[PDB]
Amino acid sequence: GVTLNDACVETYQQLKLGKKLKYIIFHLNNTEIAVEKSSDSVDYDNFLADLPEDECRWAVYDLEYEGKRNKLTFVSWAPDSAKMKQKMAYASSKDILRRALTGIAVEIQGTDFSEVAHENVLDKAS
Structure with missing residues (x-):
């Protein structure tokens, strides 16, 4: 049913290799998983703004924390107010995308904005 772009x-790989990208938002177009967007923004609140409050997404975030450490973080965004038909589609396509991304250090399943808040994500990242 579902093919990876x-x-x-x-x-x-561009996010992973050198400093042009801080995060990526993936989405279903349904038939294909695609990049909804990329960002160079260091501001974690810009990331939170691109997680739509009533739709599912996947994302990767290059999480920095305290020298300092970095961890590539996969996020399944599945907010309560999103339609169940959409949640079921993302749930059944997740692993296709997740398996293709090499070297993910942490995973987050987020059902509300507090579960993807920076402090909560930093917490889980140690």
Whole structure:
């Protein structure tokens, strides 16, 4: 049913290799997983703004914390107010995308904004 776009791994590799990207938002177009967007923004609140409050997404975030450490963080965004048909589709396609991304250090399943808040994500990242 569902096919992975080549641009997903490519953009992730770009995030992973050198400093042009801080996060990536993935989404279903349904038939293909695709990059909804990329960002160079260091501001964690810009990331939170791109998680739509009533829709599911996946994301990767290059999480920095305290020298300092970095961890590539996969986020399944599945907010309560999103439609169940959408939640079921993302749930059944997740692993396709997740398996293709090499070197993910932490995973987050988020059902409300407090579960993806920076402090909560930093907490889980140690």
